Amino acid sequence: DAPHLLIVEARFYDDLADALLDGAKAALDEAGATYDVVTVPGALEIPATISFALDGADNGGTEYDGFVALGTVIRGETYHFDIVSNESCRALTDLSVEESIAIGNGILTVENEEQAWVRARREDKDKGGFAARAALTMIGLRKKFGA
Amino acid sequence: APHLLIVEARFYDDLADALLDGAKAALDEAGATYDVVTVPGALEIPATISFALDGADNGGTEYDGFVALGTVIRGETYHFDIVSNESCRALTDLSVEESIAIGNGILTVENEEQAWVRARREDKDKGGFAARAALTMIGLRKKFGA
Amino acid sequence: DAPHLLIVEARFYDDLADALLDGAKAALDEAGATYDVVTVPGALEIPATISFALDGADNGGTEYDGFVALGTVIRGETYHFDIVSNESCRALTDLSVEESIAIGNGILTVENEEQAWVRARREDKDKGGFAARAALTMIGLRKKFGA
Amino acid sequence: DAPHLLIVEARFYDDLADALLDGAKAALDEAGATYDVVTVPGALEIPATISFALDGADNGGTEYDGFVALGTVIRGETYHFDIVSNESCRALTDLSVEESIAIGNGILTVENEEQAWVRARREDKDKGGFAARAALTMIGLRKKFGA
Amino acid sequence: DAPHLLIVEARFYDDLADALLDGAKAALDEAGATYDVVTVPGALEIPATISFALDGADNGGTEYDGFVALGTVIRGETYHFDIVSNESCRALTDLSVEESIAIGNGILTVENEEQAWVRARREDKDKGGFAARAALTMIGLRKKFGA
Ligand SMILES: O=c1[nH]c(NC[C@H](O)[C@H](O)[C@H](O)CO)c([N+](=O)[O-])c(=O)[nH]1
Ligand SMILES: O=c1[nH]c(NC[C@H](O)[C@H](O)[C@H](O)CO)c([N+](=O)[O-])c(=O)[nH]1
Ligand SMILES: O=c1[nH]c(NC[C@H](O)[C@H](O)[C@H](O)CO)c([N+](=O)[O-])c(=O)[nH]1
Ligand SMILES: O=c1[nH]c(NC[C@H](O)[C@H](O)[C@H](O)CO)c([N+](=O)[O-])c(=O)[nH]1
Ligand SMILES: O=c1[nH]c(NC[C@H](O)[C@H](O)[C@H](O)CO)c([N+](=O)[O-])c(=O)[nH]1
Ligand SMILES: [Ca+2]
Ligand SMILES: [Ca+2]
Ligand SMILES: [Ca+2]
Ligand SMILES: [Ca+2]
Ligand SMILES: [Ca+2]
Ligand SMILES: [Ca+2]
């Protein structure tokens, strides 16, 4: 009946991860939507994890109506920051189009822990909740179009 | 009369209005018809056009072209580049992979001022520029019997 | 028989557009090649147009031997420059491979209009003729190889 | 049956290569997982090798449960850094999705030799192990989804 | 029957291209492998050329064991440097994966004509030879895997 989504969380920085999740679940809960939660090491494996979910469903496995990506990448002194940020979001967008699925992108790309918390906190900019909401929104348009 | 789909990313509500207004005028003056759909941010614009095509293949509404409306203003974070890059890159592939006409109206500005100068019909009117561009692309698709 | 090209020009800066177009027709003429010219608003729609041509060809429409993409992107005070430059040249390179076609890349991406005219003018760097000639060489290779 | 991983190392900086390889084999061994180590000249050939491996598996060859990519790019005076770092990482992420395979990403992308050692040492950041571990986690998730 | 490679060179800067090709041929003679040499105008038309080579082999043409890509891009004032460098290599990297072929990437991406010479010359950094040996090595890994 109600939409059932998969929340794929890249758990690199534990505390912030809990923040994004707190808001994510909140939004889904309010909307009366259910979900499952899978934890991955870094934002880089988020797109492959959703890929895994798709293949499973095509084997009689759980079928999800939408996904929500949660993660945080903080700018240090190494170029790695761009790469982890670019590849995760790049592969995530290609995925939403090529597989025609509803994806809410909640992967932060800030310069420091300061900025992260302002966006991570639910009582603040609650980006985790904004991502869950977007996913719900997309789940809606997907139906409205007959996709 | 061509019937397009305007997919607007409503992040900055006021600028969104500026662009939409801009785009709706270019099509009206063209006698073109359209439908408007709203997504939270520029990142879901491409998957939305993808949904449109899918719904069509299933007897759904058939669109002659699409107009993409959106705005990304650089903050203090690198998020600006990501949203900009990915929404535009994906949108480009799509036009090619599905052979569809798309008017790219996704602003990639540094500050709110640049955002207002391109989003205003009275100014650069990049909202209407994308509508016309899409109309033009629609015409080409036909002339090539694609 | 002589090759028949499709010149896909992005006409954003009319005056520079003519510079490139003049240098491209010049080269093509000088080598006995014939062509068709199509106009698009910005460099972003260049690939899609070659895509339309490719679909049309598969529907009895004209069959082209090669393509000559001509365009110009001048950096502003906005990141939009990077995007137009990036996506137009990324989609093209892609198209030449995915479809195995001959394409001359004549899309300028300069810092200012001063530099624009240097690469656009046939009396100068004549990038229109260089991109045009390129397509001819590729059309040739495409044959020597058997594809 | 413990997983069998394929360690694919780009050995450009011989010493750093050893540090990462050391950290990778450490994590896998603790996990009780077996593996094979194949060497390539640079991060650019890492993804194409994993490709070679999947092809062999489809031809009765060895079948790996997951992959571990190890490499290192230190920025110098050339833009080559950007390229080597970007392409190697991008193709490696597409592959994880297109092919739906577990891939730990241990390719270092740093500004200098200092940052390189901080990250390639098992005694320190231990990126080599973090990668192997990531590959292991993905292998479990893959099975959990029955993908 | 030794391995037959295809050297695809972008002859933009005639002298640097000579240096590069020289280092490449040498490394192949010494490894005792044969090869053909095809010439293109810019690094941008290298990936398409290899593509042409593959489709030809599917139409009964010469079947190559690997490919060596040679080219040099020097940073001017224009953003064109970024594009030529990025696209050539991106298209090259993906091609190798998508087609599972052995490719040696020898496209130099430098800041000035002096950096290029230290890399181009065989009596120096010998990138041209380095690239050839890569193609050989990959041709080797491609076999050991049964790809
Ligand atoms: O989600 C993140 N993952 C990170 N790890 C990179 C990658 O996501 C994987 O964990 C690992 O590289 C191998 O897959 C980060 N940094 O390294 O800085 C980061 O800031 N954020
Ligand atoms: O269109 C925009 N969307 C934005 N949101 C990001 C993305 O478009 C999605 O809304 C959401 O991230 C996941 O669905 C922006 N910022 O965050 O800054 C922005 O400037 N512009
Ligand atoms: O060819 C160009 N098109 C441009 N327009 C962008 C795009 O090519 C399309 O015309 C339109 O955006 C919607 O399709 C440019 N700028 O905006 O600066 C530019 O410099 N060059
Ligand atoms: O793995 C690396 N390979 C490198 N070589 C480039 C490429 O990986 C291949 O070795 C070769 O270019 C042809 O395939 C590097 N640099 O040049 O700096 C580097 O830092 N790291
Ligand atoms: O291989 C190169 N090609 C170049 N031309 C770009 C491209 O490779 C094609 O020659 C042409 O653009 C049309 O195909 C270069 N510059 O312009 O500077 C360069 O330095 N190196
Ligand atoms: Ca199912
Ligand atoms: Ca229909
Ligand atoms: Ca001002
Ligand atoms: Ca004009
Ligand atoms: Ca098997
Ligand atoms: Ca220090």
Tab-separated table of N, CA and C in Angstrom, chain E residues 21-110:
chain	number	residue	atom	x	y	z
E	21	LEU	N	56.531	8.531	-30.799
E	21	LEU	CA	56.410	7.354	-31.660
E	21	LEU	C	57.698	6.542	-31.635
E	22	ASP	N	58.819	7.252	-31.601
E	22	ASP	CA	60.121	6.619	-31.564
E	22	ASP	C	60.248	5.744	-30.328
E	23	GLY	N	59.919	6.301	-29.166
E	23	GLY	CA	60.009	5.531	-27.936
E	23	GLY	C	59.063	4.344	-27.949
E	24	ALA	N	57.931	4.512	-28.626
E	24	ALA	CA	56.940	3.454	-28.720
E	24	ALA	C	57.446	2.320	-29.602
E	25	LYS	N	57.827	2.642	-30.832
E	25	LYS	CA	58.316	1.623	-31.751
E	25	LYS	C	59.459	0.820	-31.137
E	26	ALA	N	60.419	1.524	-30.543
E	26	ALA	CA	61.568	0.881	-29.916
E	26	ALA	C	61.157	-0.179	-28.900
E	27	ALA	N	60.283	0.202	-27.975
E	27	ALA	CA	59.808	-0.705	-26.938
E	27	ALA	C	59.107	-1.946	-27.506
E	28	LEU	N	58.508	-1.802	-28.684
E	28	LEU	CA	57.806	-2.914	-29.314
E	28	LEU	C	58.760	-3.802	-30.106
E	29	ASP	N	59.750	-3.188	-30.748
E	29	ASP	CA	60.718	-3.957	-31.510
E	29	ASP	C	61.418	-4.876	-30.515
E	30	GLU	N	61.897	-4.276	-29.427
E	30	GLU	CA	62.618	-4.989	-28.377
E	30	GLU	C	61.818	-6.106	-27.734
E	31	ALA	N	60.507	-5.926	-27.645
E	31	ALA	CA	59.654	-6.952	-27.067
E	31	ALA	C	59.339	-7.906	-28.198
E	32	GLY	N	59.795	-7.528	-29.388
E	32	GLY	CA	59.592	-8.335	-30.576
E	32	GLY	C	58.177	-8.410	-31.109
E	33	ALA	N	57.397	-7.350	-30.926
E	33	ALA	CA	56.020	-7.345	-31.422
E	33	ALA	C	55.900	-6.447	-32.642
E	34	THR	N	54.990	-6.788	-33.541
E	34	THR	CA	54.797	-5.984	-34.733
E	34	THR	C	53.680	-4.982	-34.498
E	35	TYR	N	53.448	-4.110	-35.475
E	35	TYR	CA	52.414	-3.094	-35.341
E	35	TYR	C	52.217	-2.269	-36.609
E	36	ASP	N	51.106	-1.548	-36.652
E	36	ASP	CA	50.824	-0.656	-37.765
E	36	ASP	C	50.740	0.718	-37.125
E	37	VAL	N	50.869	1.760	-37.933
E	37	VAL	CA	50.786	3.116	-37.417
E	37	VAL	C	49.770	3.916	-38.218
E	38	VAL	N	48.751	4.443	-37.542
E	38	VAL	CA	47.734	5.272	-38.192
E	38	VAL	C	47.824	6.679	-37.589
E	39	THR	N	47.719	7.712	-38.423
E	39	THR	CA	47.843	9.085	-37.932
E	39	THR	C	46.578	9.926	-37.923
E	40	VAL	N	46.330	10.596	-36.801
E	40	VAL	CA	45.153	11.457	-36.647
E	40	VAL	C	45.598	12.877	-36.316
E	41	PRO	N	44.732	13.869	-36.562
E	41	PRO	CA	45.043	15.280	-36.297
E	41	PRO	C	45.139	15.700	-34.832
E	42	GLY	N	44.197	15.252	-34.008
E	42	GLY	CA	44.229	15.617	-32.603
E	42	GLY	C	43.958	14.463	-31.663
E	43	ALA	N	44.311	14.638	-30.395
E	43	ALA	CA	44.106	13.596	-29.401
E	43	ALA	C	42.625	13.246	-29.319
E	44	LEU	N	41.772	14.174	-29.757
E	44	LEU	CA	40.333	13.954	-29.712
E	44	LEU	C	39.864	12.856	-30.649
E	45	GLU	N	40.541	12.663	-31.776
E	45	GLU	CA	40.082	11.625	-32.677
E	45	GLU	C	40.818	10.316	-32.498
E	46	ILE	N	41.425	10.120	-31.335
E	46	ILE	CA	42.121	8.868	-31.120
E	46	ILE	C	41.111	7.793	-30.749
E	47	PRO	N	40.288	8.033	-29.710
E	47	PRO	CA	39.326	6.988	-29.361
E	47	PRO	C	38.437	6.504	-30.504
E	48	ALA	N	37.964	7.414	-31.353
E	48	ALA	CA	37.117	7.011	-32.485
E	48	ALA	C	37.899	6.116	-33.464
E	49	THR	N	39.172	6.435	-33.676
E	49	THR	CA	40.007	5.650	-34.577
E	49	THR	C	40.094	4.204	-34.103
E	50	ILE	N	40.324	4.002	-32.813
E	50	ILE	CA	40.409	2.644	-32.301
E	50	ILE	C	39.059	1.985	-32.556
E	51	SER	N	37.983	2.723	-32.301
E	51	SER	CA	36.645	2.209	-32.539
E	51	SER	C	36.548	1.724	-33.989
E	52	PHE	N	36.965	2.571	-34.932
E	52	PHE	CA	36.947	2.227	-36.355
E	52	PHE	C	37.728	0.939	-36.564
E	53	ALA	N	38.836	0.800	-35.845
E	53	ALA	CA	39.657	-0.390	-35.981
E	53	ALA	C	38.900	-1.639	-35.524
E	54	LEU	N	38.141	-1.515	-34.439
E	54	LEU	CA	37.384	-2.654	-33.940
E	54	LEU	C	36.263	-3.090	-34.883
E	55	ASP	N	35.456	-2.144	-35.348
E	55	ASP	CA	34.371	-2.486	-36.250
E	55	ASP	C	34.898	-3.100	-37.549
E	56	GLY	N	36.075	-2.649	-37.975
E	56	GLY	CA	36.670	-3.179	-39.183
E	56	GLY	C	37.032	-4.638	-38.974
E	57	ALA	N	37.571	-4.951	-37.799
E	57	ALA	CA	37.950	-6.317	-37.477
E	57	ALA	C	36.699	-7.199	-37.450
E	58	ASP	N	35.539	-6.579	-37.280
E	58	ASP	CA	34.299	-7.339	-37.268
E	58	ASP	C	33.774	-7.489	-38.691
E	59	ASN	N	34.400	-6.769	-39.614
E	59	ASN	CA	34.027	-6.821	-41.017
E	59	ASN	C	35.146	-7.519	-41.771
E	60	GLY	N	35.857	-8.384	-41.048
E	60	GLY	CA	36.940	-9.147	-41.637
E	60	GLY	C	38.305	-8.496	-41.699
E	61	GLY	N	38.431	-7.270	-41.195
E	61	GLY	CA	39.710	-6.571	-41.232
E	61	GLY	C	40.768	-7.103	-40.279
E	62	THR	N	41.907	-6.409	-40.219
E	62	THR	CA	43.002	-6.794	-39.330
E	62	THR	C	42.544	-6.794	-37.880
E	63	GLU	N	42.882	-7.868	-37.177
E	63	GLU	CA	42.530	-8.041	-35.773
E	63	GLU	C	43.774	-7.716	-34.940
E	64	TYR	N	43.719	-6.640	-34.161
E	64	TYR	CA	44.864	-6.244	-33.346
E	64	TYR	C	44.851	-6.840	-31.939
E	65	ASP	N	46.030	-6.973	-31.353
E	65	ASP	CA	46.147	-7.518	-30.009
E	65	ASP	C	46.036	-6.416	-28.953
E	66	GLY	N	46.480	-5.216	-29.309
E	66	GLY	CA	46.407	-4.106	-28.384
E	66	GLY	C	46.567	-2.791	-29.119
E	67	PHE	N	46.467	-1.684	-28.385
E	67	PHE	CA	46.603	-0.367	-28.987
E	67	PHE	C	47.483	0.545	-28.145
E	68	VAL	N	48.258	1.393	-28.816
E	68	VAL	CA	49.121	2.359	-28.149
E	68	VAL	C	48.621	3.723	-28.615
E	69	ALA	N	48.243	4.590	-27.680
E	69	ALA	CA	47.756	5.919	-28.047
E	69	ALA	C	48.829	6.967	-27.758
E	70	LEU	N	49.193	7.749	-28.772
E	70	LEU	CA	50.212	8.787	-28.615
E	70	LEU	C	49.634	10.176	-28.902
E	71	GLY	N	49.975	11.132	-28.051
E	71	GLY	CA	49.480	12.474	-28.232
E	71	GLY	C	50.091	13.360	-27.174
E	72	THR	N	50.032	14.669	-27.396
E	72	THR	CA	50.581	15.640	-26.464
E	72	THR	C	49.688	16.860	-26.481
E	73	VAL	N	49.268	17.308	-25.304
E	73	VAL	CA	48.446	18.506	-25.225
E	73	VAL	C	49.217	19.452	-24.313
E	74	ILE	N	49.466	20.665	-24.794
E	74	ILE	CA	50.195	21.652	-24.020
E	74	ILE	C	49.245	22.783	-23.664
E	75	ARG	N	49.277	23.201	-22.402
E	75	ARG	CA	48.409	24.265	-21.907
E	75	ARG	C	48.677	25.645	-22.491
E	76	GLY	N	47.686	26.187	-23.190
E	76	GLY	CA	47.818	27.519	-23.751
E	76	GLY	C	47.199	28.488	-22.759
E	77	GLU	N	46.334	29.374	-23.243
E	77	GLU	CA	45.665	30.342	-22.371
E	77	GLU	C	44.213	29.913	-22.217
E	78	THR	N	43.715	29.295	-23.281
E	78	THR	CA	42.341	28.831	-23.392
E	78	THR	C	42.003	27.560	-22.625
E	79	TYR	N	40.727	27.431	-22.269
E	79	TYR	CA	40.198	26.277	-21.546
E	79	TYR	C	40.233	25.013	-22.421
E	80	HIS	N	40.545	25.197	-23.701
E	80	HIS	CA	40.604	24.105	-24.665
E	80	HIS	C	41.528	22.980	-24.202
E	81	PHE	N	42.546	23.336	-23.428
E	81	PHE	CA	43.495	22.363	-22.894
E	81	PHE	C	42.755	21.303	-22.069
E	82	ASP	N	41.953	21.760	-21.110
E	82	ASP	CA	41.183	20.877	-20.234
E	82	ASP	C	40.324	19.893	-21.011
E	83	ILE	N	39.612	20.417	-22.000
E	83	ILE	CA	38.731	19.616	-22.834
E	83	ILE	C	39.467	18.538	-23.633
E	84	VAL	N	40.432	18.940	-24.449
E	84	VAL	CA	41.188	17.984	-25.245
E	84	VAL	C	41.781	16.894	-24.346
E	85	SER	N	42.413	17.311	-23.253
E	85	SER	CA	43.004	16.370	-22.300
E	85	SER	C	41.968	15.418	-21.697
E	86	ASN	N	40.910	15.981	-21.121
E	86	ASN	CA	39.869	15.182	-20.497
E	86	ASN	C	39.149	14.206	-21.417
E	87	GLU	N	38.534	14.718	-22.475
E	87	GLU	CA	37.784	13.867	-23.394
E	87	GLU	C	38.574	12.733	-24.056
E	88	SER	N	39.761	13.029	-24.567
E	88	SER	CA	40.568	11.990	-25.192
E	88	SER	C	40.753	10.836	-24.224
E	89	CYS	N	41.220	11.145	-23.019
E	89	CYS	CA	41.473	10.121	-22.004
E	89	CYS	C	40.227	9.451	-21.429
E	90	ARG	N	39.153	10.209	-21.262
E	90	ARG	CA	37.930	9.635	-20.740
E	90	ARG	C	37.420	8.619	-21.766
E	91	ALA	N	37.274	9.061	-23.012
E	91	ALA	CA	36.790	8.179	-24.060
E	91	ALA	C	37.703	6.972	-24.205
E	92	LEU	N	39.001	7.168	-23.971
E	92	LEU	CA	39.966	6.081	-24.093
E	92	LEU	C	39.819	5.075	-22.968
E	93	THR	N	39.658	5.584	-21.756
E	93	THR	CA	39.511	4.717	-20.601
E	93	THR	C	38.243	3.879	-20.729
E	94	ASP	N	37.114	4.531	-20.982
E	94	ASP	CA	35.868	3.798	-21.099
E	94	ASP	C	35.917	2.757	-22.197
E	95	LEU	N	36.446	3.142	-23.349
E	95	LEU	CA	36.559	2.244	-24.493
E	95	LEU	C	37.214	0.923	-24.081
E	96	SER	N	38.360	1.025	-23.413
E	96	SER	CA	39.087	-0.155	-22.981
E	96	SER	C	38.198	-1.063	-22.138
E	97	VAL	N	37.445	-0.495	-21.205
E	97	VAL	CA	36.564	-1.318	-20.381
E	97	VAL	C	35.417	-1.915	-21.197
E	98	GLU	N	34.621	-1.032	-21.799
E	98	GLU	CA	33.462	-1.403	-22.604
E	98	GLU	C	33.763	-2.417	-23.706
E	99	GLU	N	34.999	-2.436	-24.196
E	99	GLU	CA	35.381	-3.369	-25.250
E	99	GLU	C	36.369	-4.426	-24.779
E	100	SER	N	36.905	-4.259	-23.577
E	100	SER	CA	37.882	-5.206	-23.037
E	100	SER	C	39.090	-5.336	-23.955
E	101	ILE	N	39.794	-4.230	-24.165
E	101	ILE	CA	40.971	-4.243	-25.026
E	101	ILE	C	42.213	-3.705	-24.297
E	102	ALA	N	43.404	-4.131	-24.719
E	102	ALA	CA	44.636	-3.665	-24.086
E	102	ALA	C	45.054	-2.334	-24.700
E	103	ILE	N	45.071	-1.273	-23.890
E	103	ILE	CA	45.437	0.065	-24.366
E	103	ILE	C	46.545	0.745	-23.559
E	104	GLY	N	47.544	1.274	-24.255
E	104	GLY	CA	48.622	1.977	-23.582
E	104	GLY	C	48.358	3.459	-23.766
E	105	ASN	N	48.103	4.169	-22.673
E	105	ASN	CA	47.801	5.596	-22.747
E	105	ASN	C	49.047	6.483	-22.732
E	106	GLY	N	49.404	7.013	-23.902
E	106	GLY	CA	50.578	7.857	-24.018
E	106	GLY	C	50.292	9.297	-24.407
E	107	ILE	N	49.123	9.799	-24.024
E	107	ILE	CA	48.773	11.176	-24.329
E	107	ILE	C	49.299	12.087	-23.232
E	108	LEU	N	50.333	12.861	-23.547
E	108	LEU	CA	50.911	13.781	-22.577
E	108	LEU	C	49.995	14.981	-22.375
E	109	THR	N	49.893	15.411	-21.126
E	109	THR	CA	49.066	16.551	-20.750
E	109	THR	C	49.965	17.450	-19.919
E	110	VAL	N	50.736	18.309	-20.582
E	110	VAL	CA	51.675	19.170	-19.879
E	110	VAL	C	51.381	20.656	-19.952
